[PDB]
Amino acid sequence: QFLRTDDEVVLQCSATVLKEQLKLRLAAEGFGNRLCFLEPTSNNVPPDLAICCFTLEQSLSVRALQEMLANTGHRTLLYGHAILLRHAHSRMYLSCLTTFDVGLQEDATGEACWWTMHPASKQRSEGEKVRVGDDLILVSVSSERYLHLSTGELQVDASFMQTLWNMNPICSCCEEGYVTGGHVLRLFHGDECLTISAADSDDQRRLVYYEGGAVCTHARSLWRLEPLRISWSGSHLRWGQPLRIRHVTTGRYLALTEDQGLVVVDACKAHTKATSFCFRVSKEKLRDVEGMGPPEIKYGESLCFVQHVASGLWLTYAALKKKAILHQEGHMDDALFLTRCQQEESQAARMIHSTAGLYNQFIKGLDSFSGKPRPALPIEAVILSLQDLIGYFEPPSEELQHEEKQSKLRSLRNRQSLFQEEGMLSLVLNCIDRLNVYTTAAHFAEYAGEEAAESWKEIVNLLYELLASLIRG
C-alpha cells in the first residue's frame, strides 16, 4: 500500500463544477502539444486514459538530487523526496515549463522535471513512506512552486497557490507474460486477427472483421484492454472481469447496438451496458481486489472466449476477410488467443490517432471558410505536430556505424509503413491541396485572419517536408 519506483500512476485532483463532483487526471499528448490538461471523469463514460499514465522513474533525497545535478531497485517513496515522472506514451518527463506553466519536456537534464512530495496533513511527516490514497502537494524543484489546479475552463499550472493531489496507482510489478489492463494487443483466431477495415473504406471503419495476411503487422488490428475501474486498471486481468475494448488508432469502442449489432462506437456513446465485454474460459452458464491480484490470463498460451456481459452473446464470425458478429451460440472454434504489441508499434498507433484527429480538425476548419470571404485553426498545434513528425521520420546519420544503420533503417521503414497503411499520405496531401487553393499568404488572409496567414508559408513547407519524409527510403 506504498508507492514504489517503477510503478505506474495517474495524478488526480478533485473539483465540484456545475454543482457536480469530478475527479480530474493530469494528461498531456506530448507530440503536437507539450502542455498538460485535465482529463475529467464524472459520475460518466470511458476517458482518454493512455495519455494519463505516468511512471515513477526515480525518488531522490534532496542531498542525492543535488549530487546528481552536480555530477554527470524498487525504492519506496518517502515524503520530502523528489521524483521524476515519465509520460508513458510520449516518453517525455513532467516538468515546469518557463513562460511558469506545466507540461512535457524532452530531456531529464536539469531541475525542471523534478518534484518534491510533501505531506498534506499532520498525519504524515518527512521520511515516512508515501501511502496509496494520500493527498499530497507537489513542489517544482526548479521554481519552488505548486502543481496547481486553475479556474470557466479547468486548467493546470504552477502558481504559489496549493492544490491537493492523489497519486492513484495503475500498476506495479506483474507476473511475466500475463495480460494486465491498459495493455495494447492483438486478438488472434486460429493468421486471422480481429480488426476494422482500412482507412477510407465504405465501412466508415465502423465494422469488425477477422482478417489474415498483413494486418498482423498493421496498426488497425491493435486494441487496448480497459477495465471499468480506473484504480488498479493496470492489474492482472481475470476471467469474467468486465472490460472495454478500444481500437487504438480510431479511439472507438467495441460495442453491441440495437440496430447495427456488433460494431465499433464513438467514445461519447460508449455506455457501459453496450461496451462491456469479458474473457471466458468456456461457454458454460456461469470481489474486486486492490493490487495486481491473481495472474489468470497468459499471452499466447491462453485460449479465451469473448463474451458481451449484458447480453451473454459470443464474439464469433459470420463466415480471407470474415465479418465478426455477436451470436448466442457462436462456433466451436471461437476461442481467440492474445499477443502483446511491442512498444514502438504501440506508440506509433497512438501518434497516428492524435495526428489524424489534429489534421482532420485543421481540414474541417479550412472548409468552414472556403467559399466565405472576410473556429480558430490549430496553427500552433499543426506546426508542432509537423516538426515532431519530421524528426520522428528523420533518417540516421551517415556517420553512424553501418550495422546500426541497417537496424535504424528497418525501424524507420516500419514506422513509415504503419502511418502509410493508415491513410496518412492522403491526409497530408489533403492539407496541401486545401492550402494551395490560395496563391499567396495575402490571398489566404482574405478568407482566414491575417494572423493565421503569418504561418501559411510555414505550414505548407512543413507539410511538404513531412510528405518527403514519409516516402523517402
Q: 199-204: long-range contacts (C-beta < 8 A, 24 or more apart)?
A: 199/421, 199/422, 199/423, 199/426, 200/423, 200/426
| Distance of alpha carbon 299 from alpha carbon 174, whole angstroms | 13
**Spatial CA neighbour of 349 closest among 442, 246, 467:** 246
- Cell digits of residue 190: 486460429
Question: What is the SS3 assignment for 142?
Answer: coil
| Distance of alpha carbon 219 from alpha carbon 419, whole angstroms | 8
Exposed (0-12), middle (13-18) or buried (19+): which is 20, by Cβ within 10 Å? exposed
What's the reported resolution, in angstroms, to a tenth?
2.8
| Bridge partners for 321 per DSSP | 211
| Distance of alpha carbon 210 from alpha carbon 306, whole angstroms | 14
Return the half-sphere exposure (C-beta side, CA atoms, 13 A cut-off) of residue 326. 24
Residue 423 DSSP code: T
C-alpha separations of 154 from 23, 24, 48, 147, 150 in Å? 12, 9, 17, 14, 6
| Distance of alpha carbon 59 from alpha carbon 114, whole angstroms | 9
Domains of the chain plus CATH, in order, are 1-172 (2.80.10.50), 173-341 (2.80.10.50), 342-473 (1.25.10.30)
| Bridge partners for 147 per DSSP | 158
Q: To which residue does cell 502483446 refer?
A: 340
**Spatial CA neighbour of 417 closest among 216, 135, 160:** 216
**Do residues 311 and 326 touch, judged by C-beta distance below 8 A?**
yes
Phi, then psi, of 445 in degrees rounded to 5? -60, -20
Radius of gyration of the chain (CA): 24
Alpha helices in 36-191 (DSSP H): 62-70
Q: Report the 10 Å Cβ neighbour count for 176.
A: 8
Q: What is the DSSP string of 21-70?
A: EEEEEEE---SS--B-EEEEEE-------TTT-EEEEEEE-HHHHHHHHH
Q: Report the 10 Å Cβ neighbour count for 164.
A: 17
Report residue 341 CA to chain centroid gap.
14
| Bridge partners for 364 per DSSP | none
CB proximity list for 279: less than 8 A, separation 6 or greater: 237, 239, 240, 241, 297, 304, 305, 306, 307
**Spatial CA neighbour of 276 closest among 229, 331, 212, 214:** 229
- Cell digits of residue 364: 474541417
Alpha helices in 188-277 (DSSP H): 272-275
Q: To which residue does cell 492513484 refer?
A: 168
Beta strands in 151-297 (DSSP E): 155-159, 165-171, 184-189, 193-195, 209-211, 223-227, 243-247, 253-256, 262-265, 277-280
CB proximity list for 338: less than 8 A, separation 6 or greater: 179, 185, 186, 187, 188, 297, 299, 300, 302, 304
**Do residues 338 and 193 touch, judged by C-beta distance below 8 A?**
no
- Cell digits of residue 196: 476494422
**Spatial CA neighbour of 307 closest among 336, 270, 287:** 336
| Distance of alpha carbon 18 from alpha carbon 307, whole angstroms | 38
Phi, then psi, of 192 in degrees rounded to 5? -60, 135
| Distance of alpha carbon 2 from alpha carbon 129, whole angstroms | 7
| Distance of alpha carbon 369 from alpha carbon 286, whole angstroms | 57
